[PDB]
Amino acid sequence: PTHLSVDTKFKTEGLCVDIPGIPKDMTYRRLISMMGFKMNYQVNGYPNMFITREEAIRHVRAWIGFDVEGCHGTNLPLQLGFSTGVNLVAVPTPLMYKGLPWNVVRIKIVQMLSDTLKNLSDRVVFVLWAHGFELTSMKYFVKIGPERTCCLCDRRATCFSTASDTYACWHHSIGFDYVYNPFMIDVQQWGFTGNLQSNHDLYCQVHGNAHVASCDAIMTRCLAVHECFVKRVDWTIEYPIIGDELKINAACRKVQHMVVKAALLADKFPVLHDIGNPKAIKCVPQADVEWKFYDAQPCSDKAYKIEELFYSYHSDKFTDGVCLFWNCNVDRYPANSIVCRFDTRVLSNLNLPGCDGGSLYVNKHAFHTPAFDKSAFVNLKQLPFFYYSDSPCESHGIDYVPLKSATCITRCNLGGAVCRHHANEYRLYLDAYNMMISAGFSLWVYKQFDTYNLWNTFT
Ligand SMILES: CN1CCN(C(=O)c2ccc(F)c(F)c2)CC1
Numbered sequence: 469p470t471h472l473s474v475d476t477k478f479k480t481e482g483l484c485v486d487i488p489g490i491p492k493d494m495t496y497r498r499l500i501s502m503m504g505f506k507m508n509y510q511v512n513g514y515p516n517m518f519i520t521r522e523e524a525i526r527h528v529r530a531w532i533g534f535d536v537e538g539c540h541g542t543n544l545p546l547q548l549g550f551s552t553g554v555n556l557v558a559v560p561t562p563l564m565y566k567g568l569p570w571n572v573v574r575i576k577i578v579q580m581l582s583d584t585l586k587n588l589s590d591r592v593v594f595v596l597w598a599h600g601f602e603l604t605s606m607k608y609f610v611k612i613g614p615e616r617t618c619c620l621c622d623r624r625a626t627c628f629s630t631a632s633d634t635y636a637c638w639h640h641s642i643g644f645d646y647v648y649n650p651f652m653i654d655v656q657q658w659g660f661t662g663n664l665q666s667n668h669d670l671y672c673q674v675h676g677n678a679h680v681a682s683c684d685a686i687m688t689r690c691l692a693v694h695e696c697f698v699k700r701v702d703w704t705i706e707y708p709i710i711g712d713e714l715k716i717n718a719a720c721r722k723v724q725h726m727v728v729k730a731a732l733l734a735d736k737f738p739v740l741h742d743i744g745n746p747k748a749i750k751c752v753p754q755a756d757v758e759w760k761f762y763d764a765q766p767c768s769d770k771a772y773k774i775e776e777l778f779y780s781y782h783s784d785k786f787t788d789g790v791c792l793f794w795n796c797n798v799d800r801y802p803a804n805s806i807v808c809r810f811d812t813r814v815l816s817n818l819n820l821p822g823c824d825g826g827s828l829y830v831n832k833h834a835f836h837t838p839a840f841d842k843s844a845f846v847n848l849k850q851l852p853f854f855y856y857s858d859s860p861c862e863s864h865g866i867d868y869v870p871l872k873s874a875t876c877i878t879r880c881n882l883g884g885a886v887c888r889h890h891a892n893e894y895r896l897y898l899d900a901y902n903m904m905i906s907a908g909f910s911l912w913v914y915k916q917f918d919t920y921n922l923w924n925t926f927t
């Protein structure tokens with residue numbers, strides 16, 4: 469049990485308005501044949517165009533919702549909608565493109581998928597709420613065969629060109645006209661009562677139905693994300709390295725140590741309530757503070773209500789000392805907090821669009837995060853950048869330009885001249901900090917926080 473068997477049954481009830489008279493009894497093997505594709509008993513890495521829910525989850529980065537709406541098909545033009553917001557009109561002769569023949573529509577489809585996916589995945593997964601026209605339109609822009617490699621590199625082939633008889637990955641497909649060996653999954657096979665809008669609208673109020681094909685495509689991928697990452701959570705699945713994952717995670721650990729250590733030095737709280745990951749470890753092991761842990765897994769649906777995380781009868785007096793919410797998404801943080809909250813609006817290769825304003829952050833594991841809400845931070849302020857160090861000024865062991873900065877909180881800067889060691893360390897920390905902020909993380913602190921209070925930790 470690795471791939472989806474072609475002899476698995478496919479419910480055809482969702483297809484019978486576009487395809488009247490369709491057999492109730494149907495397998496993937498028969499459906500693929502009906503779509504105009506011949507699989508030829510091929511044992512070459514592509515056993516089925518359709519995939520299991522588990523395989524779709526492992527390839528979430530490849531997901532592109534796809535819907536085809538009859539404009540008037542063979543006699544009628546088709547509207548092709550994608551979860552990128554694109555709408556193309558194909559003639560058989562929110563981006564709305566006028567009616568053009570399939571030979572130019574297919575070139576645009578290869579361009580769009582390659583630009584959307586080259587930095588995310590090695591394939592495309594067409595996410596459907598299948599009614600008929602999308603499955604029968606695939607023959608016009610999809611070619612299938614054995615698994616192949618790119619003509620310009622070692623990556624797997626995702627495109628094909630009839631002009632040159634060659635294959636390409638998403639990075640080298642300029643001028644290619646066919647999508648090669650795409651994958652697909654029909655959300656209607658998952659057991660749903662009612663149409664797409666009624667099921668989507670149960671969990672999401674951000675995507676509307678402007679009665680256009682790309683709207684349905686967006687709603688379909690959104691519903692597929694809710695089922696696989698919001699109401700079902702599997703944090704065991706590992707995902708490939710596609711960007712700055714390692715630098716981002718390292719920066720987050722450095723920033724956490726720095727910020728918490730400085731808060732403990734400046735305000736000397738007697739107790740720290742660490743609320744979040746049940747696997748968390750003391751980020752400042754040398755601090756005198758009474759460190760107390762509270763377990764709460766990452767919320768994927770709605771942000772935690774502070775009343776449920778805290779109240780209902782632990783020091784119990786969460787008002788005493790400071791609360792650390794490191795990636796613990798709550799509706800309204802208490803005033804005595806140190807907070808790291810992922811901004812779901814961030815544009816990046818790690819952050820995929822999610823359900824109800826939320827986003828799916830994929831860095832080693834998939835974490836659907838609830839919508840970023842500025843009101844959660846009303847009792848706090850934005851934590852300003854600063855670098856603090858009590859380590860000795862000693863070079864040991866990269867050229868130099870004298871560093872001058874009001875945010876380099878060290879003994880050497882206090883004594884009017886930053887040493888080479890704290891200047892290298894300051895610049896490295898500033899880079900780690902910028903990496904974290906650019907990845908989408910936002911830092912928030914109690915209003916009494918003042919880096920001026922750190923200078924006296926040097927006597
Ligand atoms: C005389 N000491 C005792 C109390 N003290 C700490 O508790 C402390 C140590 C290291 C840290 F990183 C930190 F955040 C806090 C610093 C001053």
Ligand SMILES: [Zn+2]
Nearest residue numbers: 618621637640
């Ligand atoms: Zn290539």
Ligand SMILES: [Zn+2]
Nearest residue numbers: 672675690824
């Ligand atoms: Zn939605």
Ligand SMILES: [Zn+2]
Nearest residue numbers: 861880887890
């Ligand atoms: Zn120094």
